[PDB]
């Protein structure tokens, strides 16, 4: 007698939100916000450099913890909490900018600056940079006056950049414990250092005085840097207080830099990283970490946003 049309249904649907309705039940639905983290740095197929105890800025200056990182090559660079940029206590001026450069550098190649010295010492060392006995930053030279209280002569040193990519130049400035220690090291009087390239002008007079004993030492070393362009020349006028660059750094190519506290894993591949690990997902959004980096789903504040993949559920 009769023929009837109908549609499938379940006893119990999945609730989703629409333009007009909160919590309408549908036959099937799926998640659009990723919540699953992988608690490893998934680095399958990538040249990875885990800096460990080496601080990223220490790869340019070379404290003992960074000896195996002086010319690293990488697609992915991992900074660790235990990293330290320094052996002799000190810090870099414009430090975060420099970390950002080095994170995407592809790693670094090193080249001799070509400085020679006459009328001064060049081999200043210390207890805090330990290589079986006292030492110093592997890429740097601590310039002193020939002997205690001797006049450190006014000096003029050049380096031209004969390569086709910008050279990263780093130099330091020493801050002795005393005002009397500045005289012993480089002779008494106000010392001046200046730096000049096509688009750079800056000068630094030292500032002695006591500081807290870091690494058992109360002195500090300032660290400074600029990018010297191809065919550009850079000049260093100095009367003392000055830590001379031995080598220049050139950037290799391209990389991605992350900070993290979890283990490397070459068994999984991922392109979205955060400190707690790797977000592997095809979903358009994620609610794990708003500071995730790489190629990531967009961060949203919602934990879940279900997308209907079936008709509305209208049970018996």
């Amino acid at each position: 007698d009769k023929i009837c049309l109908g549609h499938h249904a379940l006893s119990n649907g999945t609730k989703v939100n629409t333009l007009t309705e909160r919590g309408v039940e549908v036959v099937n639905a799926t998640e659009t916000v990723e919540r699953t983290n992988i608690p490893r740095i998934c680095s399958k197929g990538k040249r990875t450099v885990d800096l460990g105890q080496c601080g990223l800025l220490g790869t340019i200056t070379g404290p003992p913890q960074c000896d195996q990182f002086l010319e690293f090559s990488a697609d992915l660079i991992i900074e660790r909490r235990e990293g330290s940029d320094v052996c002799y206590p000190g810090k870099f001026v414009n430090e975060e900018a420099l970390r950002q450069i080095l994170r995407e550098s592809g790693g670094i190649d090193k080249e001799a600056m070509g400085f020679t010295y006459s009328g001064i010492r060049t081999n200043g060392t210390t207890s805090a940079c330990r290589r079986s006995g006292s030492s110093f930053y592997a890429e740097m030279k601590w310039l002193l006056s020939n002997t205690d209280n001797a006049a450190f002569p006014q000096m003029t040193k050049s380096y031209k950049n004969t390569r086709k990519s910008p050279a990263l130049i780093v130099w330091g400035i020493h801050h002795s414990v005393s005002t009397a220690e500045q005289t012993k090291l480089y002779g008494s009087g106000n010392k001046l250092v200046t730096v000049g390239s096509s688009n750079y002008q800056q000068s630094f007079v030292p500032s002695p005085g006591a500081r807290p004993q870091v690494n058992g030492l109360s002195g500090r070393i300032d660290f400074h840097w600029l990018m010297l362009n191809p065919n550009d020349t850079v000049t260093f006028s100095f009367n003392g207080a000055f830590i001379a660059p031995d080598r220049a750094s050139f950037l290799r190519g391209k990389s991605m830099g992350i900070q993290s506290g979890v283990q490397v894993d070459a068994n999984c591949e991922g392109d979205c990283y955060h400190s707690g690990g790797t977000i592997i997902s095809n979903l358009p959004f994620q609610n794990i970490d708003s500071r995730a980096v790489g190629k990531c789903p967009r961060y949203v504040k919602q934990r879940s946003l279900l997308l209907a993949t079936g008709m509305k559920n209208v049970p018996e």
Binding site: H7, H8, T18, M311
Partner: protein, 170 residues
């Protein structure tokens, strides 16, 4: 939904229909039976899967660190960064919420219409040999054996061969 079929003039869905999304349930001298319509089912599945294909992806756009979790950046620049990130988070949270609600509205309506399109197809096949029940059923005047019912399902049913006898039962 908009087309008034699902959760509309059709009272409810069938929990026994595990074969497809839509289907026919007949009742004749030989008894009741139920069968899934492939075409309608497949058209809805294909549209829904096409939505997923569009939506299930992230972009090839890389973003790098601009601040530092181990060594806090200067406060002023840091606050500008946080303000900017939070502003962006607010845009995407909105986008995501609106996208899903809009899609879900359309998905439900899309399924509603496919149900309606099947309903109207059959009405047109039956011509003057049947009349609308109102609950999603077509009462048939002439005698449809299980063969007859399968002809309707498979789009081969010829209305003219049963017309007079159905018409005579007006």
């Amino acid at each position: 939904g908009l087309f008034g079929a699902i959760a509309g003039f059709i009272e409810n869905g069938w929990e026994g229909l595990i074969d497809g999304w839509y289907g026919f349930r007949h009742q004749n001298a030989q008894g009741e039976g139920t069968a899934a319509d492939y075409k309608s089912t497949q058209s809805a599945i294909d549209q829904i899967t096409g939505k997923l294909n569009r939506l299930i992806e992230k972009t090839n756009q890389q973003f790098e660190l601009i601040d530092n979790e181990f060594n806090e950046v200067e406060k002023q620049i840091g606050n500008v960064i946080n303000w900017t990130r939070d502003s962006i988070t607010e845009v995407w949270s909105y986008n995501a919420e609106l996208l899903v609600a809009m899609e879900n509205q359309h998905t439900i309506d899309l399924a509603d219409s496919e149900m309606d399109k099947l309903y109207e197809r059959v009405k047109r096949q039956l011509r003057e040999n049947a009349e609308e029940d109102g609950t999603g059923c077509f009462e048939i005047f002439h005698k449809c054996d299980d063969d007859c019912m399968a002809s309707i399902r498979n789009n081969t049913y010829d209305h003219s061969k049963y017309r007079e006898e159905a018409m005579q039962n007006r």
